Design a protein around this ligand. Structure first.
Ligand SMILES: CC(/C=C/C(=O)NO)=C\[C@@H](C)C(=O)c1ccc(N(C)C)cc1
Ligand SMILES: CC(/C=C/C(=O)NO)=C\[C@@H](C)C(=O)c1ccc(N(C)C)cc1
Ligand SMILES: [K+]
Ligand SMILES: [K+]
Ligand SMILES: [Zn+2]
Length: 364
């Protein structure tokens, strides 16, 4: 105990990048290269069963994933009806892949419930876009939702924090009408930017009003600003909501160098957000997500695992399998691009206040 659970397994990693460039392997490989796995408790992930996946997804949709997984993106009549397309490729293995991811996250939640640790990690998870009966944005199964549902079998109030560049709409929609789970997401909100939801006036509905928190941010934000913002909101959510457990997806598609070319963050900035949450001392389920500069994604998460362990890593990338992927420079640190931060300090303030306000109506 008191020692972090690391959901991994050579078979689990093979499955994650078995469709979608091999990224799971690079992440684990860099963590292993830093010997971080020796400081954690490695736990083999179970594979989610239909019942478990049905906790959120409809069987009609789950069955479709099987069908397609077994055959292919062939001219199937119901594929469009279920989100499969360019954004969410129909392929062989799709159902198995989802099931492994869903199980990994459910397994991590189990570890947290069983008191086996205070932090459980699943870097291959965090696919927050999936809907109950529809695929979206590379998410076939919403593992985060399944983890949250699993945690509730033990924790009264769950706080979901999504730091992916994209709005965590799949997760938000799932708990839109409840106050048992609060979703907070910092993301890019601009015309035509996927998924198109998450404006700041998006606060939830019914008993869920004010239990959905969204922070729209513009291109080029850097560590300092981000942390100011994120810490501002979190401090207020912790006071107003009083979570007993935390699910945190840390997609790296916000990091400088990403093909998404939106935010201008470094892993140190995200790591500060992570330390803040860790400080709370609550059961925490860490998830991955976006991140499409593979080498950059692994650099980031390897650094965050270090943060979790409270360990300092060396700037120099250790030699290992995918070593040549680490740049002219082969270092851990990432350098923010020379792009402007179009986040007007005034609007950011209007947002913080608007959120502070809505969090006022929260009383447990
Ligand atoms: C999103 C993108 C490029 C964006 C871009 O170029 N924007 O400008 C490329 C895809 C093919 C990709 O790399 C990927 C990697 C891992 C993954 N999972 C681990 C599920 C799913 C997809
Ligand atoms: C949906 C998304 C990111 C989601 C995310 O990060 N969720 O966390 C990115 C889209 C806009 C994209 O750029 C793209 C590029 C290539 C591609 N194929 C080659 C199949 C499919 C999609
Ligand atoms: K987000
Ligand atoms: K909610
Ligand atoms: Zn994303």
């Amino acid at each position: 105990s008191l020692v972090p659970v690391y959901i991994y397994s050579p078979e689990y990693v093979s499955m994650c990048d078995s469709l979608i460039p091999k990224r799971a392997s690079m992440v684990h490989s860099l963590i292993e290269a830093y010997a971080l796995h020796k400081q954690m408790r490695i736990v083999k992930p179970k594979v989610a069963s239909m019942e478990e996946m049905a906790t959120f997804h409809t069987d009609a949709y789950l069955q479709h994933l099987q069908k397609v997984s077994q055959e292919g993106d062939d001219d199937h009549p119901d594929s469009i009806e279920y989100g499969l397309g360019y954004d969410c490729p129909a392929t062989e293995g799709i159902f198995d892949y989802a099931a492994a991811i869903g199980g990994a996250t459910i397994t991590a939640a189990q570890c947290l419930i069983d008191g086996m640790c205070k932090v459980a990690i699943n870097w291959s998870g965090g696919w927050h876009h999936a809907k109950k009966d529809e695929a979206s944005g590379f998410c076939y199964l919403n593992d985060a939702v399944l983890g949250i549902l699993r945690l509730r079998r033990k924790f009264e109030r769950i706080l979901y924090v999504d730091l992916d560049l994209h709005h965590g709409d799949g997760v938000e929609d799932a708990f839109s009408f409840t106050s048992k789970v609060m979703t907070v997401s910092l993301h890019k909100f601009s015309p035509g930017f996927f998924p198109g939801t998450g404006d700041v006036s998006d606060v939830g509905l019914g008993k869920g009003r004010y239990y959905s928190v969204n922070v729209p941010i513009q291109d080029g934000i850097q560590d300092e600003k981000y942390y100011q913002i994120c810490e501002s909101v979190l401090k207020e959510v912790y006071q107003a909501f009083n979570p007993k457990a935390v699910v945190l997806q840390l997609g790296a598609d916000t990091i400088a160098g990403d093909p998404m070319c939106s935010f201008n963050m470094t892993p140190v900035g995200i790591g500060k957000c992570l330390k803040y949450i860790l400080q709370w001392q609550l059961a925490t389920l860490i998830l991955g997500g976006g991140g499409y500069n593979l080498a950059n994604t692994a650099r980031c998460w390897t650094y965050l695992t270090g943060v979790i362990l409270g360990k300092t890593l060396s700037s120099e990338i250790p030699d290992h399998e995918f070593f040549t992927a680490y740049g002219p420079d082969y270092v851990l640190e990432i350098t923010p691009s020379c792009r402007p931060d179009r986040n007007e300090p005034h609007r950011i303030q209007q947002i913080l206040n608007y959120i502070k306000g809505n969090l006022k109506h929260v009383v447990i």
